[model samples]
Target: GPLVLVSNNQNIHFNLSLENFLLNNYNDLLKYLNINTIEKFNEPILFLWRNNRSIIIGKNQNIWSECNLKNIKEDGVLVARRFTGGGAVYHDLGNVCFTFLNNNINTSSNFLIILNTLKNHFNIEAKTQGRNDITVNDQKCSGSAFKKIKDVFLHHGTILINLEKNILNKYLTTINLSEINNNITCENLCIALIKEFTKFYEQNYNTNIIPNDITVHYIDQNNNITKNPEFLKYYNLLKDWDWCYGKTPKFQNHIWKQFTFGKLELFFNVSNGFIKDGNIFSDCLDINLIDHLKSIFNNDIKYSKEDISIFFKKLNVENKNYLDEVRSWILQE
Candidate 1:
């Protein structure tokens, strides 16, 4: 009934290896929340999987200030906001991500055993460096985030094996996503991690594994995993624009640019996802461009380029070089 420790007996893992869909990775993320908070499952879950190419950010981060928004949109990169708190991290197919969902789970112990597993199998050494990361050769290869839900905990980390380090750093801030990244099989790594998680739990508790009913399942268009209509609600919540961007904390910015109208300073403030305030303090508005400036910098708009673009399109403000520049200045912010 309570979040009494389950590890004193056994651990449960809802491990699913994805076959092509990135959104399913998130769909299953919602699926697991139900299992943890709403469902009757009591044992801790070890969820391990990876993404194609996505940028995941913590709950409280200001995505606009943390990464290049235009760059992310332009490159058609997938973006996700998770329930954890950490700096933005980029994911690609070459890396593996793991989550420990249960009570009293700490990142350090998880890191240590994964390191122990790697050393035992791959003969490589890595060490936990900070709150939610591990380093090898003094460069950050793996990063993590944490959350606690309904008396349960989630501590997740990623391992870099042949990860595209340059792209990882390029998309995310230059926070050093580099690592040794040797040629090691990811599934083997996955097996090692799950095994290590189980072994570590058993050893730490000084208990014997009487039996583990841990099982694995897959979700596809072909497979109907859950019919509960409540999942639809959870899906919409995860994908909502407010949940993704509006949840960002209050932030202000000043981006200077030279436009056809005049040398302009773009001052913008975003809180709860709306452009609470924005102004273009122009040295001089080109006589031909006064109406253009007025139409664009109207106060209290959504802090999104697409919304502004759509606004400009319907307002009959596009195609002009000045309007384009206005969009550029605001979107780049």
Candidate 2:
């Protein structure tokens, strides 16, 4: 089949809301489509526009662990996770997101094509650098990530044209991806790097062509180029706390710290990589699975793909269908 286009020219500012997108779309797509995860589709793309703000995270990351959630929520900012694995990113109208859905195509080749297209159009040396990023003159201008299913894949990334540096610095917290404590705050470094890259793009590629007219295929359920109900619904779900944080999975060997913040005993569990569990102990909480969770405490459980599948099956037998919630917690963490 030829590439299906689902394009939207949304004036609404983009928000960090990838969780909603996956919950609302990926499940259905997996169930309904006969797609191959490794098969390559020709240049299929979903181009979207955001108005003024948003924060996007990788699929398996924990929002609470990666961001200053209290501050972001208070400021009415959006935080979400995508179906891909990578670091978090911020977006605005000055930025654009392109989602490529395909199978089997060489990732490097696909990226190179896009980079060369931009280079030819703008007369600038936009080049692919590292594993999945585009840089101009040694500064990164875009970052990409992908999600692979049994028979299909989704690759999406961000192109920075413009965004707010000051707001980002005020609202984000930094976590080290590696074990090294670089002490670099996520918001500060992200904003600084992206802003610097954007300035470089403008300075080097300010051709006569109106930036908006550079066409790419946009695909969604709505069939309209500018609006997609499915996409919007997914976006809104990312704004929900239950889906964003409450659905995170339980874990063993998770480290927790408790402190008295005024009248409340604030408990925080930090998973080595992502959030592994959560508890709101205000006497209003009741769940019998706590005992089961405790049973596995300090037990060395393998974290391989096969081991996780087996773990879920065993947990389901014990908890009787609380598996969904538990699985959500585990995966989200």
Candidate 3:
């Protein structure tokens, strides 16, 4: 034998492009440390993937402020809170979502591959715009965000060939409703763009039938993800209140409301994603109610907003009018 070497740090690739999966599958695959180690060669594997109707928010986002939890749950749309800070994006079947578990955090070139692929395939004049969005005719058709995990980096993005405006507007913030649709379907876009993504990747790095640095395989065939190790745990952990709610950065909202009496100035300070401390200075109400309202609203959690509504629905008769007014003021927005 010339030499024999084996290591636990094996590089792998999962072709999730075939089926519509929960975004957590990709997250688990990319973020799980043992799977992402790299040595020297290229395992520039490609994944063509998609998630069903969902709203994926950055790690720092307030889910209630960024998403319509009511519509999301009722419609059976999924929600994924990411380990990165970028923007909240809506996902539909029409979008081609991808992740590159690479050894580098370089995202500009990966973004360009998408921009040029849109033009190459559809003849659309898509160009990279502010931050990490690919726009066609100054309207956004694709957007991307990234995160790094120890030795490997994962960059994921969505190519929005089309989306339901009603669902988008309902489940998320207001939108410009510009034309993000292209002639390419996500299925076709997945096929075409992965070709481009891998093509450029190989042109820049490795061109071997098998990578020297990594062990690669498609997740779809790796004995069904439901059977995969730690999959259920990964699935449940990401959607848990701890990940979705507890991780949100402390934030504040300033409400300038006009009541029947006069102008009211309200400052709401929130911590651990809740209504922390609020001061209401109105020419309208009593000092006593303000103090009571503060206690009622104090430390009241606003995780994903079902908790918020539950808190508000516990209205007592005495403080009903004032507290209800305060509740509406904080909730509006």
Candidate 4:
């Protein structure tokens, strides 16, 4: 039988950081509803949230390769990778992020249907553009990406409302020259598009809509509330440099340039899931994690569920207190 999911219209305001939302809710939703396994709850879920300034990357993207770290740190923006793959995007309170998890649908096709529906609802000419963007009159209004786990498919997208254009352009350093390098600039395009889109949606959909009357659901029959303690722990782990930046697959190439005390260049050649070759060029000499991190290389470790658990246990012993520090970085702000 086909699953029928009605829009509950139970709006939930997390009023927490992005890390907290993922930690306390994501897995709980799966487990509480017995959707932990591959079979149940493999249907679509729609989730929406607003965040402060943050840079979110795709699953396969190397954090160093995709973002300008110097700018990111200088601006004090958070960097994170979702459990899906596509491209890098920035978010703020002005951005509304929507996540849909389901099964048995072609991701791109399903997204188009939703995009069209949204446009029609707002009486606008918004159209799906590029591989994963929805644009109005050639200006991108939203960017989206997808992830699939067993039979469970997850799709999340961002809607720009009233973002800071200057800050966005300074932080979102895209590699591809096509749209990223064009004179439009990331900030101008996103900021302008979002403002216009918001105006359109509000004029059409916000009539007689009050905050209390339009509620969204954060927790269902599952204990996936944005306040779950266990989920918070997991979310903290994701925020760590180890999980966010350190966990890049071995055999990948990463180039990182940072201007901490001065300009510094870090080039890494990873293999067998570890850093096989590394170099650092800088005027300062205080940086020293290169060698310690080498142990993560050629360790015959896989990133699968079992492999991560075993690796964490070994890392705990090898790094001792340092491991705890890394874990703490992920959990705390």
Best TM-score goes to which candidate? 1
lDDT of each: 0.55, 0.46, 0.54, 0.48
lDDT of each residue in 66-134, candidate 1, tens digit only: 677677888877676665555677776677777666556566777777898778777777777766767
- Expressed as tens digits, the lDDT of each residue in 222-313 for candidate 3 is 44554555554655656577766543333377667665433455567767777666654443223334444445456657734577656667
Write down the RMSD of all candidates, one decimal each: 14.5, 13.4, 14.1, 14.2
TM-score of each: 0.58, 0.51, 0.57, 0.52
Q: Which stretches of candidate 2 lie over 4 Å from their true place?
A: 4-6, 9-51, 174-237, 246-252, 255-333
- Which of candidates 1 and 4 reaches a greater lDDT? 1
Quote model 2's TM-score.
0.51
Candidate 4: deviation at residue 305, Å? 32
**Residue-wise lDDT of candidate 2 within 246-301, one digit each (tens)?**
44544344432221210111233435533244443211011233334433433445
Q: Write the per-residue lDDT of candidate 4 for residues 78-132, one digit (tens) a residue.
A: 7776654455677766556655555544556555545544444444556676546
Total clashing pairs in model 4: 16
What's the C-alpha lDDT at position 72 in model 4?
86
> Looking at candidate 2, what is the lDDT of residue 318?
34
Candidate 2 Cα deviation (angstroms), residue 213 = 14
Q: Candidate 1: what lDDT?
A: 0.55
